[PDB]
Each structure stands twice: as structure tokens, then as C-alpha cells.
Amino acid sequence: TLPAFGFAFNASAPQFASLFTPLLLPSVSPNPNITVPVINDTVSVGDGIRILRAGIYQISYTLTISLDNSPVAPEAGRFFLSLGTPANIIPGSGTAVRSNVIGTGEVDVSSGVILINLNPGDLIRIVPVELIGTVDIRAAALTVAQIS
Amino acid sequence: TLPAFGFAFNASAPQFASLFTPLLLPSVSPNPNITVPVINDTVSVGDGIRILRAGIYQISYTLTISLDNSPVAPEAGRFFLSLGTPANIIPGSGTAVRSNVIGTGEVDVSSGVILINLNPGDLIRIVPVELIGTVDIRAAALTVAQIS
Amino acid sequence: TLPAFGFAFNASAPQFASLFTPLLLPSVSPNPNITVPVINDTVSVGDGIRILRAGIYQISYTLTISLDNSPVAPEAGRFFLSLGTPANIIPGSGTAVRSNVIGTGEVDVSSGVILINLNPGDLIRIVPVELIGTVDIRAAALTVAQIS
Ligand SMILES: [Ca+2]
Ligand SMILES: [Ca+2]
Ligand SMILES: [Ca+2]
């Protein structure tokens, strides 16, 4: 049987990060020639991916983060993957960024990869858990791929 | 059947990013003890990987990017994976970096992971699509692994 | 047969980077609901993962790096995965970060993904190979997943 997988992303709609608020991931169709959902036995719900098949999964997320130092300097965010409710964070999935206190204009990329046992009904989302300032998420992506 | 895969990288030759110009990836042999091509039913062409087998693929890329703020400040780059011609970018694969307008010396890492349906003949490359300044790509890497 | 895999991380104990000294990765159990080792035919040794099964592996690492510019500015680190002894670095796995020479407070994420042929007894670890200053590794993670 082909492994379960899913890919959800936001390529064209920046969003500001809010505490314990899952990032929006409206798209599932990355190939520009044969443009179809890259989904097999998972469900993209609009802010993440729901597992339908118990198994071991490799999960990645990638964020492009603009910390322009307005209206406060520095700006910072700490992000995790969450299982179910947004506060139910996954240790091992955390990443964090912070700008310099001087100047303006920094844009950074955070990406993380984990492996995790998951079960039917588990909802995987990207959640900001600590924020300073207005943290602009220019793009976001979430990959889920069963190891089998 | 073993999944198709390929790994192409540039570990020892920095290159400046140019618009719509695929990054050079001359090496395929990462193990320092048993130093062999990590290639199975793909082809490394020198600036990316060509697919030979239809399937679902997890693709990653990793870049170490020096934005020294010379000759302009800030410096910035936006990168995507491309399918076929360099302008045929893959939504969901984008990353971007930008230095502070003040000071000098920033070096950043961008990494992205996607899942994508691909077909025989598809050529996957890393492409800069927007640039400010002289963006020094100190190291680059591209992984392609079929999910099957 | 299910692919070999392992996940080792450090979520709750920052460590400063030292030359040729593998980063500490004490945890293997990321799911907060069903909290179990995500290990199959590998061994987590406390500073990395030992391979038990010959095969092709996708390996990732993710670091959250604080470069506060004290006691020197800038601060910088270059990291690789190592095979066996810490100086036996894997070309293609390198990443590097450096702060601005001005100001303070930068926190960056580095993540890298490779594919590699590996053999029983191979020990995979994350190693700093060049350092400037006191480079604070706030969190670290290492994924190993056989492609089969
Ligand atoms: Ca802001
Ligand atoms: Ca420059
Ligand atoms: Ca320091």
C-alpha cells in the first residue's frame, strides 16, 4: 500500500502570527503543469492536516518570516507543530527567530523536520506559542509523509 | 521496488545568485567513508535532478546564504524549486531572506521541503526569482526521494 | 519490512556549541499524547543516532541558534553531520550562520536535509566545525529515515 501523505501550503497570502492560532494553509496543489492535490489518506482542513491512518510520519514545516522591527524592536516568534488543540505542542518540533534590536528589514527562513507516531483523527498544525511584535509570515508549508 | 531518489549538492564552491539561473550542484557523493553516488532512477545534470519514474516525491533544498551588505544594503533573495524551464516555479517551495539595512556580515540558512507528483523527464532545480544585491550562495543541496 | 528510523532531539536544555563536540540529543519521544520512542532498528546514544541496518537514509537536522553578540560581535557557527569520529564530516550536510557585526539579539534557524548510504555501526551526529564566539544552541533535532 502506498504511504499516506499530504502537503498544505500558503504561497500567496501573508498573515501575521497570533498566539496559539494555527497558520492558514489553503493550498494543496504545487505542480504548475499537472496541478492536483498532493493528498493520500489525509485531509487538508485549511490550517493543517488531519491523519486518517495510524503510522509513523515524517513531518516538516517551512516558514518565511519578516521581522521588520515595526512597531517594536526586536520582533520574535517561537513556533511548534501541535497535535489536536493548539496548546498541545510537539516537543522536538520547536523553532524560533528574533531580529536584531538595531535597524530594520530582516527576513528569515525557519524550517523543522520531525518523526512521530500518529493515529486516526490527529490534527497537525503550525502554531506560534510566543511572539514579540508583528511577526509577518510571508509563506508557510507543511508536509506529512508516512514512513512505511 | 526501491524508491527512486537522488541527492545533488555544492559543498566547496560558492556562487552568486543570478535571476532565473539554476544553482550549480556538481556533487552526488556525500559519504566520506564509502563515497558513491546517492542516485537511484534519477539523473543529476549539474544544476539539478531529472525524474525518470512517475511518482510522488518529497523534495528538499538547503542553502547557506551570505548577505554582506556590499555593494548595497540590504541584500535579499527569493528562491523556488522550478519544474522544467527556470521560470516555471513550484508554489509551496518558495523561501526568502533579507539582511538588515544596517551593518554587515549576516549569513543565513534557508531550507524548504515539499511533496509533489512528478513525471518522467521533469527537471527539478533551485532558482532565484528575485534578488537585491550580490547574494552569495555558500553551499546548496537538493534531495529528491520517492514516497512509495 | 518497515523502514528503519530514529528521532533524537533536545527541546528543553540549551547548550553552547564547542568545536568538534557533538550536540546533545537526550529525547526520543515527541508525541505529547502517546509519548513513546520514535525508534525502529536504530539506537539513540545521547548525542546522535547509530545505524543498525544497511540502507539509504534521508537525514535532517534542525537548530535554533542564538547569536547575541556577547562577548564578541559577530558570532558565527558552521555545522555538519558527522559519520563516526566528529571530524569525519559529511559533504552536503553543511550549514552556517553569522550575526550582524552591529547590535544584539539575533536568533536564527538552520535546517539541512541529505540522502546517504549508511552501514551497520555508523554513528550520525551534529558537529560544530567552526565557531566564533559563544553560539547558543537553544534547541536541536536529528531525524534518520530509511528510504526503502
Ligand atoms: Ca513587524
Ligand atoms: Ca553582497
Ligand atoms: Ca554569545
Numbering used by the authors:
A (entry chain A), B (entry chain A), C (entry chain A): 20 to 167
What did the published study say regarding this structure?
The exosporium is a prominent bipartite structure comprised of a paracrystalline basal layer and an external hair-like nap. Each filament of the nap is formed solely by a trimer of the collagen-like glycoprotein BclA. One of these proteins is BxpB (also called ExsFA), which is required for the attachment of approximately 98% of the BclA present in the exosporium. In this process, each filament of the nap is attached to a basal layer surface protrusion that appears to be formed by a trimer of BxpB.
